[PDB]
PDB file of N, CA and C and ligand atoms in Angstrom:
ATOM      1  N   UNK G   1     -29.547 -12.607  -4.891  1.00 44.33           N
ATOM      2  CA  UNK G   1     -30.084 -13.658  -4.035  1.00 44.33           C
ATOM      3  C   UNK G   1     -29.494 -13.582  -2.631  1.00 44.33           C
ATOM      4  N   UNK G   2     -28.639 -12.590  -2.407  1.00 41.51           N
ATOM      5  CA  UNK G   2     -28.059 -12.360  -1.087  1.00 41.51           C
ATOM      6  C   UNK G   2     -26.973 -13.331  -0.679  1.00 41.51           C
ATOM      7  N   UNK G   3     -26.459 -14.152  -1.618  1.00 43.87           N
ATOM      8  CA  UNK G   3     -25.494 -15.166  -1.224  1.00 43.87           C
ATOM      9  C   UNK G   3     -24.199 -14.595  -0.733  1.00 43.87           C
ATOM     10  N   UNK G   4     -23.829 -13.381  -1.096  1.00 46.58           N
ATOM     11  CA  UNK G   4     -22.629 -12.738  -0.590  1.00 46.58           C
ATOM     12  C   UNK G   4     -22.922 -11.717   0.501  1.00 46.58           C
ATOM     13  N   UNK G   5     -24.153 -11.619   1.006  1.00 42.64           N
ATOM     14  CA  UNK G   5     -24.439 -10.537   1.952  1.00 42.64           C
ATOM     15  C   UNK G   5     -23.564 -10.554   3.192  1.00 42.64           C
ATOM     16  N   UNK G   6     -23.474 -11.724   3.832  1.00 44.95           N
ATOM     17  CA  UNK G   6     -22.730 -11.761   5.089  1.00 44.95           C
ATOM     18  C   UNK G   6     -21.245 -11.534   4.865  1.00 44.95           C
ATOM     19  N   UNK G   7     -20.651 -12.135   3.830  1.00 45.58           N
ATOM     20  CA  UNK G   7     -19.212 -11.900   3.639  1.00 45.58           C
ATOM     21  C   UNK G   7     -18.988 -10.446   3.232  1.00 45.58           C
ATOM     22  N   UNK G   8     -19.902  -9.827   2.478  1.00 47.01           N
ATOM     23  CA  UNK G   8     -19.747  -8.403   2.122  1.00 47.01           C
ATOM     24  C   UNK G   8     -19.660  -7.580   3.393  1.00 47.01           C
ATOM     25  N   UNK G   9     -20.579  -7.777   4.295  1.00 46.12           N
ATOM     26  CA  UNK G   9     -20.582  -6.948   5.511  1.00 46.12           C
ATOM     27  C   UNK G   9     -19.312  -7.186   6.321  1.00 46.12           C
ATOM     28  N   UNK G  10     -18.798  -8.428   6.352  1.00 46.54           N
ATOM     29  CA  UNK G  10     -17.547  -8.689   7.098  1.00 46.54           C
ATOM     30  C   UNK G  10     -16.369  -8.023   6.397  1.00 46.54           C
ATOM     31  N   UNK G  11     -16.257  -8.115   5.072  1.00 41.03           N
ATOM     32  CA  UNK G  11     -15.033  -7.522   4.503  1.00 41.03           C
ATOM     33  C   UNK G  11     -15.140  -6.001   4.448  1.00 41.03           C
ATOM     34  N   UNK G  12     -16.307  -5.411   4.111  1.00 42.53           N
ATOM     35  CA  UNK G  12     -16.400  -3.960   4.200  1.00 42.53           C
ATOM     36  C   UNK G  12     -16.193  -3.504   5.636  1.00 42.53           C
ATOM     37  N   UNK G  13     -16.639  -4.270   6.623  1.00 45.52           N
ATOM     38  CA  UNK G  13     -16.391  -3.904   8.023  1.00 45.52           C
ATOM     39  C   UNK G  13     -14.917  -3.840   8.324  1.00 45.52           C
ATOM     40  N   UNK G  14     -14.144  -4.803   7.798  1.00 46.16           N
ATOM     41  CA  UNK G  14     -12.693  -4.772   8.035  1.00 46.16           C
ATOM     42  C   UNK G  14     -12.148  -3.451   7.506  1.00 46.16           C
ATOM     43  N   UNK G  15     -12.518  -3.076   6.298  1.00 45.19           N
ATOM     44  CA  UNK G  15     -12.038  -1.842   5.680  1.00 45.19           C
ATOM     45  C   UNK G  15     -12.538  -0.624   6.459  1.00 45.19           C
ATOM     46  N   UNK G  16     -13.818  -0.578   6.805  1.00 44.58           N
ATOM     47  CA  UNK G  16     -14.387   0.537   7.585  1.00 44.58           C
ATOM     48  C   UNK G  16     -13.532   0.788   8.827  1.00 44.58           C
ATOM     49  N   UNK G  17     -13.116  -0.280   9.499  1.00 45.36           N
ATOM     50  CA  UNK G  17     -12.391  -0.159  10.758  1.00 45.36           C
ATOM     51  C   UNK G  17     -10.951   0.292  10.528  1.00 45.36           C
ATOM     52  N   UNK G  18     -10.336  -0.227   9.470  1.00 46.93           N
ATOM     53  CA  UNK G  18      -8.891  -0.157   9.313  1.00 46.93           C
ATOM     54  C   UNK G  18      -8.398   0.806   8.255  1.00 46.93           C
ATOM     55  N   UNK G  19      -9.245   1.390   7.435  1.00 45.62           N
ATOM     56  CA  UNK G  19      -8.886   2.399   6.460  1.00 45.62           C
ATOM     57  C   UNK G  19      -9.355   3.766   6.909  1.00 45.62           C
ATOM     58  N   UNK G  20      -8.533   4.764   6.544  1.00 49.13           N
ATOM     59  CA  UNK G  20      -9.063   6.106   6.811  1.00 49.13           C
ATOM     60  C   UNK G  20     -10.273   6.358   5.915  1.00 49.13           C
ATOM     61  N   UNK G  21     -11.191   7.160   6.445  1.00 52.06           N
ATOM     62  CA  UNK G  21     -12.344   7.596   5.667  1.00 52.06           C
ATOM     63  C   UNK G  21     -11.902   8.435   4.477  1.00 52.06           C
ATOM     64  N   UNK G  22     -10.669   8.957   4.486  1.00 50.96           N
ATOM     65  CA  UNK G  22     -10.225   9.828   3.405  1.00 50.96           C
ATOM     66  C   UNK G  22      -9.670   9.136   2.172  1.00 50.96           C
ATOM     67  N   UNK G  23      -9.766   7.821   2.073  1.00 51.00           N
ATOM     68  CA  UNK G  23      -8.854   7.039   1.261  1.00 51.00           C
ATOM     69  C   UNK G  23      -8.987   7.187  -0.252  1.00 51.00           C
ATOM     70  N   UNK G  24      -7.821   7.148  -0.901  1.00 50.20           N
ATOM     71  CA  UNK G  24      -7.762   7.177  -2.358  1.00 50.20           C
ATOM     72  C   UNK G  24      -8.234   5.847  -2.971  1.00 50.20           C
ATOM     73  N   UNK G  25      -8.623   5.879  -4.243  1.00 53.19           N
ATOM     74  CA  UNK G  25      -9.040   4.621  -4.902  1.00 53.19           C
ATOM     75  C   UNK G  25      -7.874   3.637  -4.899  1.00 53.19           C
ATOM     76  N   UNK G  26      -6.643   4.077  -5.148  1.00 52.48           N
ATOM     77  CA  UNK G  26      -5.489   3.179  -5.050  1.00 52.48           C
ATOM     78  C   UNK G  26      -5.342   2.580  -3.655  1.00 52.48           C
ATOM     79  N   UNK G  27      -5.581   3.391  -2.608  1.00 53.24           N
ATOM     80  CA  UNK G  27      -5.477   2.846  -1.248  1.00 53.24           C
ATOM     81  C   UNK G  27      -6.542   1.791  -1.004  1.00 53.24           C
ATOM     82  N   UNK G  28      -7.744   2.048  -1.533  1.00 55.03           N
ATOM     83  CA  UNK G  28      -8.807   1.057  -1.311  1.00 55.03           C
ATOM     84  C   UNK G  28      -8.558  -0.188  -2.135  1.00 55.03           C
ATOM     85  N   UNK G  29      -8.048  -0.077  -3.374  1.00 53.52           N
ATOM     86  CA  UNK G  29      -7.735  -1.271  -4.155  1.00 53.52           C
ATOM     87  C   UNK G  29      -6.709  -2.105  -3.397  1.00 53.52           C
ATOM     88  N   UNK G  30      -5.658  -1.479  -2.856  1.00 50.70           N
ATOM     89  CA  UNK G  30      -4.662  -2.253  -2.085  1.00 50.70           C
ATOM     90  C   UNK G  30      -5.309  -2.901  -0.869  1.00 50.70           C
ATOM     91  N   UNK G  31      -6.197  -2.237  -0.135  1.00 46.51           N
ATOM     92  CA  UNK G  31      -6.832  -2.848   1.019  1.00 46.51           C
ATOM     93  C   UNK G  31      -7.766  -3.998   0.643  1.00 46.51           C
ATOM     94  N   UNK G  32      -8.434  -3.820  -0.506  1.00 45.50           N
ATOM     95  CA  UNK G  32      -9.302  -4.910  -0.971  1.00 45.50           C
ATOM     96  C   UNK G  32      -8.468  -6.135  -1.305  1.00 45.50           C
ATOM     97  N   UNK G  33      -7.216  -5.950  -1.761  1.00 47.40           N
ATOM     98  CA  UNK G  33      -6.414  -7.140  -2.098  1.00 47.40           C
ATOM     99  C   UNK G  33      -5.976  -7.923  -0.881  1.00 47.40           C
ATOM    100  N   UNK G  34      -5.973  -7.295   0.281  1.00 45.68           N
ATOM    101  CA  UNK G  34      -5.530  -7.939   1.503  1.00 45.68           C
ATOM    102  C   UNK G  34      -6.672  -8.269   2.447  1.00 45.68           C
ATOM    103  N   UNK G  35      -7.862  -7.687   2.316  1.00 48.28           N
ATOM    104  CA  UNK G  35      -8.912  -7.736   3.310  1.00 48.28           C
ATOM    105  C   UNK G  35      -9.365  -9.163   3.591  1.00 48.28           C
ATOM    106  N   UNK G  36      -9.492 -10.009   2.532  1.00 44.86           N
ATOM    107  CA  UNK G  36     -10.040 -11.327   2.830  1.00 44.86           C
ATOM    108  C   UNK G  36      -9.184 -12.140   3.785  1.00 44.86           C
ATOM    109  N   UNK G  37      -7.860 -11.932   3.787  1.00 44.70           N
ATOM    110  CA  UNK G  37      -6.994 -12.702   4.679  1.00 44.70           C
ATOM    111  C   UNK G  37      -7.275 -12.400   6.149  1.00 44.70           C
ATOM    112  N   UNK G  38      -7.940 -11.296   6.476  1.00 47.88           N
ATOM    113  CA  UNK G  38      -8.263 -10.904   7.844  1.00 47.88           C
ATOM    114  C   UNK G  38      -9.608 -11.470   8.296  1.00 47.88           C
ATOM    115  N   UNK G  39     -10.336 -12.115   7.406  1.00 47.68           N
ATOM    116  CA  UNK G  39     -11.596 -12.715   7.834  1.00 47.68           C
ATOM    117  C   UNK G  39     -11.346 -14.136   8.339  1.00 47.68           C
ATOM    118  N   UNK G  40     -12.269 -14.699   9.086  1.00 45.30           N
ATOM    119  CA  UNK G  40     -12.062 -16.074   9.552  1.00 45.30           C
ATOM    120  C   UNK G  40     -11.862 -17.008   8.367  1.00 45.30           C
ATOM    121  N   UNK G  41     -11.072 -18.045   8.566  1.00 43.06           N
ATOM    122  CA  UNK G  41     -10.738 -18.962   7.470  1.00 43.06           C
ATOM    123  C   UNK G  41     -11.943 -19.491   6.704  1.00 43.06           C
ATOM    124  N   UNK G  42     -13.065 -19.899   7.312  1.00 40.63           N
ATOM    125  CA  UNK G  42     -14.170 -20.427   6.483  1.00 40.63           C
ATOM    126  C   UNK G  42     -14.669 -19.462   5.417  1.00 40.63           C
ATOM    127  N   UNK G  43     -14.437 -18.167   5.536  1.00 41.90           N
ATOM    128  CA  UNK G  43     -14.877 -17.170   4.580  1.00 41.90           C
ATOM    129  C   UNK G  43     -13.893 -16.879   3.472  1.00 41.90           C
ATOM    130  N   UNK G  44     -12.687 -17.423   3.562  1.00 42.23           N
ATOM    131  CA  UNK G  44     -11.564 -16.991   2.736  1.00 42.23           C
ATOM    132  C   UNK G  44     -11.881 -17.082   1.250  1.00 42.23           C
ATOM    133  N   UNK G  45     -12.201 -18.269   0.763  1.00 39.22           N
ATOM    134  CA  UNK G  45     -12.444 -18.424  -0.683  1.00 39.22           C
ATOM    135  C   UNK G  45     -13.713 -17.690  -1.117  1.00 39.22           C
ATOM    136  N   UNK G  46     -14.729 -17.631  -0.300  1.00 38.98           N
ATOM    137  CA  UNK G  46     -15.941 -16.902  -0.636  1.00 38.98           C
ATOM    138  C   UNK G  46     -15.617 -15.423  -0.761  1.00 38.98           C
ATOM    139  N   UNK G  47     -14.808 -14.926   0.161  1.00 40.90           N
ATOM    140  CA  UNK G  47     -14.437 -13.500   0.154  1.00 40.90           C
ATOM    141  C   UNK G  47     -13.612 -13.194  -1.102  1.00 40.90           C
ATOM    142  N   UNK G  48     -12.695 -14.092  -1.478  1.00 36.84           N
ATOM    143  CA  UNK G  48     -11.910 -13.852  -2.695  1.00 36.84           C
ATOM    144  C   UNK G  48     -12.836 -13.728  -3.899  1.00 36.84           C
ATOM    145  N   UNK G  49     -13.841 -14.641  -3.974  1.00 36.44           N
ATOM    146  CA  UNK G  49     -14.782 -14.626  -5.070  1.00 36.44           C
ATOM    147  C   UNK G  49     -15.567 -13.327  -5.065  1.00 36.44           C
ATOM    148  N   UNK G  50     -16.065 -12.930  -3.901  1.00 39.40           N
ATOM    149  CA  UNK G  50     -16.835 -11.709  -3.740  1.00 39.40           C
ATOM    150  C   UNK G  50     -16.059 -10.497  -4.225  1.00 39.40           C
ATOM    151  N   UNK G  51     -14.847 -10.329  -3.725  1.00 38.76           N
ATOM    152  CA  UNK G  51     -14.013  -9.178  -4.048  1.00 38.76           C
ATOM    153  C   UNK G  51     -13.721  -9.173  -5.549  1.00 38.76           C
ATOM    154  N   UNK G  52     -13.403 -10.342  -6.141  1.00 37.96           N
ATOM    155  CA  UNK G  52     -13.164 -10.309  -7.579  1.00 37.96           C
ATOM    156  C   UNK G  52     -14.401  -9.907  -8.373  1.00 37.96           C
ATOM    157  N   UNK G  53     -15.558 -10.410  -7.963  1.00 37.64           N
ATOM    158  CA  UNK G  53     -16.786 -10.113  -8.707  1.00 37.64           C
ATOM    159  C   UNK G  53     -17.230  -8.670  -8.510  1.00 37.64           C
ATOM    160  N   UNK G  54     -17.081  -8.108  -7.307  1.00 36.53           N
ATOM    161  CA  UNK G  54     -17.632  -6.783  -7.002  1.00 36.53           C
ATOM    162  C   UNK G  54     -16.559  -5.692  -6.966  1.00 36.53           C
ATOM    163  N   UNK G  55     -15.310  -6.019  -7.285  1.00 39.57           N
ATOM    164  CA  UNK G  55     -14.243  -5.032  -7.179  1.00 39.57           C
ATOM    165  C   UNK G  55     -14.547  -3.701  -7.842  1.00 39.57           C
ATOM    166  N   UNK G  56     -15.021  -3.658  -9.071  1.00 39.10           N
ATOM    167  CA  UNK G  56     -15.231  -2.329  -9.680  1.00 39.10           C
ATOM    168  C   UNK G  56     -16.211  -1.495  -8.884  1.00 39.10           C
ATOM    169  N   UNK G  57     -17.336  -2.068  -8.460  1.00 38.82           N
ATOM    170  CA  UNK G  57     -18.345  -1.242  -7.766  1.00 38.82           C
ATOM    171  C   UNK G  57     -17.883  -0.927  -6.354  1.00 38.82           C
ATOM    172  N   UNK G  58     -17.115  -1.828  -5.756  1.00 37.79           N
ATOM    173  CA  UNK G  58     -16.583  -1.554  -4.428  1.00 37.79           C
ATOM    174  C   UNK G  58     -15.652  -0.348  -4.488  1.00 37.79           C
ATOM    175  N   UNK G  59     -14.774  -0.258  -5.462  1.00 40.14           N
ATOM    176  CA  UNK G  59     -13.843   0.874  -5.471  1.00 40.14           C
ATOM    177  C   UNK G  59     -14.621   2.154  -5.655  1.00 40.14           C
ATOM    178  N   UNK G  60     -15.627   2.146  -6.504  1.00 35.67           N
ATOM    179  CA  UNK G  60     -16.441   3.354  -6.770  1.00 35.67           C
ATOM    180  C   UNK G  60     -17.156   3.832  -5.518  1.00 35.67           C
ATOM    181  N   UNK G  61     -17.667   2.927  -4.703  1.00 34.19           N
ATOM    182  CA  UNK G  61     -18.482   3.321  -3.551  1.00 34.19           C
ATOM    183  C   UNK G  61     -17.610   3.600  -2.336  1.00 34.19           C
ATOM    184  N   UNK G  62     -16.537   2.844  -2.138  1.00 33.48           N
ATOM    185  CA  UNK G  62     -15.789   2.980  -0.879  1.00 33.48           C
ATOM    186  C   UNK G  62     -15.085   4.328  -0.772  1.00 33.48           C
ATOM    187  N   UNK G  63     -14.805   5.006  -1.875  1.00 34.25           N
ATOM    188  CA  UNK G  63     -14.211   6.337  -1.775  1.00 34.25           C
ATOM    189  C   UNK G  63     -15.247   7.340  -1.255  1.00 34.25           C
ATOM    190  N   UNK G  64     -16.528   6.967  -1.306  1.00 37.65           N
ATOM    191  CA  UNK G  64     -17.572   7.820  -0.742  1.00 37.65           C
ATOM    192  C   UNK G  64     -18.123   7.398   0.615  1.00 37.65           C
ATOM    193  N   UNK G  65     -18.169   6.102   0.908  1.00 38.18           N
ATOM    194  CA  UNK G  65     -18.831   5.609   2.116  1.00 38.18           C
ATOM    195  C   UNK G  65     -18.300   4.212   2.422  1.00 38.18           C
ATOM    196  N   UNK G  66     -18.083   3.897   3.673  1.00 35.73           N
ATOM    197  CA  UNK G  66     -17.589   2.573   4.041  1.00 35.73           C
ATOM    198  C   UNK G  66     -18.502   1.883   5.045  1.00 35.73           C
ATOM    199  N   UNK G  67     -19.668   2.438   5.342  1.00 36.44           N
ATOM    200  CA  UNK G  67     -20.567   1.741   6.270  1.00 36.44           C
ATOM    201  C   UNK G  67     -20.946   0.358   5.724  1.00 36.44           C
ATOM    202  N   UNK G  68     -20.701  -0.745   6.408  1.00 37.08           N
ATOM    203  CA  UNK G  68     -20.943  -2.067   5.771  1.00 37.08           C
ATOM    204  C   UNK G  68     -22.376  -2.295   5.346  1.00 37.08           C
ATOM    205  N   UNK G  69     -23.375  -2.042   6.171  1.00 36.52           N
ATOM    206  CA  UNK G  69     -24.757  -2.350   5.768  1.00 36.52           C
ATOM    207  C   UNK G  69     -25.138  -1.505   4.587  1.00 36.52           C
ATOM    208  N   UNK G  70     -24.781  -0.216   4.581  1.00 36.28           N
ATOM    209  CA  UNK G  70     -25.136   0.651   3.446  1.00 36.28           C
ATOM    210  C   UNK G  70     -24.431   0.203   2.170  1.00 36.28           C
ATOM    211  N   UNK G  71     -23.116   0.009   2.261  1.00 35.00           N
ATOM    212  CA  UNK G  71     -22.372  -0.363   1.051  1.00 35.00           C
ATOM    213  C   UNK G  71     -22.938  -1.662   0.478  1.00 35.00           C
ATOM    214  N   UNK G  72     -23.186  -2.630   1.353  1.00 34.91           N
ATOM    215  CA  UNK G  72     -23.604  -3.935   0.840  1.00 34.91           C
ATOM    216  C   UNK G  72     -25.008  -3.906   0.269  1.00 34.91           C
ATOM    217  N   UNK G  73     -25.880  -3.063   0.812  1.00 32.76           N
ATOM    218  CA  UNK G  73     -27.197  -2.808   0.212  1.00 32.76           C
ATOM    219  C   UNK G  73     -27.021  -2.117  -1.132  1.00 32.76           C
ATOM    220  N   UNK G  74     -26.258  -1.011  -1.171  1.00 32.01           N
ATOM    221  CA  UNK G  74     -26.166  -0.229  -2.411  1.00 32.01           C
ATOM    222  C   UNK G  74     -25.604  -0.999  -3.605  1.00 32.01           C
ATOM    223  N   UNK G  75     -24.618  -1.883  -3.391  1.00 31.12           N
ATOM    224  CA  UNK G  75     -24.065  -2.671  -4.479  1.00 31.12           C
ATOM    225  C   UNK G  75     -24.891  -3.910  -4.799  1.00 31.12           C
ATOM    226  N   UNK G  76     -25.938  -4.184  -3.990  1.00 29.17           N
ATOM    227  CA  UNK G  76     -26.825  -5.305  -4.375  1.00 29.17           C
ATOM    228  C   UNK G  76     -26.448  -6.621  -3.702  1.00 29.17           C
ATOM    229  N   UNK G  77     -25.421  -6.649  -2.852  1.00 30.03           N
ATOM    230  CA  UNK G  77     -24.962  -7.877  -2.198  1.00 30.03           C
ATOM    231  C   UNK G  77     -25.951  -8.262  -1.102  1.00 30.03           C
ATOM    232  N   UNK G  78     -26.595  -7.289  -0.470  1.00 32.77           N
ATOM    233  CA  UNK G  78     -27.620  -7.465   0.542  1.00 32.77           C
ATOM    234  C   UNK G  78     -28.928  -6.828   0.067  1.00 32.77           C
ATOM    235  N   UNK G  79     -29.715  -7.557  -0.703  1.00 29.85           N
ATOM    236  CA  UNK G  79     -30.855  -6.942  -1.359  1.00 29.85           C
ATOM    237  C   UNK G  79     -31.884  -6.251  -0.469  1.00 29.85           C
ATOM    238  N   UNK G  80     -32.052  -6.587   0.806  1.00 27.10           N
ATOM    239  CA  UNK G  80     -33.193  -6.114   1.579  1.00 27.10           C
ATOM    240  C   UNK G  80     -34.140  -5.288   0.715  1.00 27.10           C
TER     241      UNK G  80
HETATM  242 MG1   MG S 101     -23.488 -15.128  -8.790  1.00 30.01          MG
HETATM  243 MG1   MG S 102      -7.468 -15.489  11.039  1.00 26.84          MG
HETATM  244 MG1   MG S 103      -4.316 -19.179   6.515  1.00 27.06          MG
END
């Protein structure tokens, strides 16, 4: 239903900017645990929920691609 689309693009964007493209799954899991704290406060709890719900698919995809619009489309967070 796209309810996490905007927060997905913001948190994957944080990672896209701040993680190397070469990153290990362990490196991405650690970044996912910290990423929501870097978003504006109104997104904080939504981002925590998003990351907990999508963590498995996020780790699988982010080792291959970190573009926010693509990642969020591919995992279903942004249905377009
Ligand atoms: Mg739901
Ligand atoms: Mg802040
Ligand atoms: Mg705070």
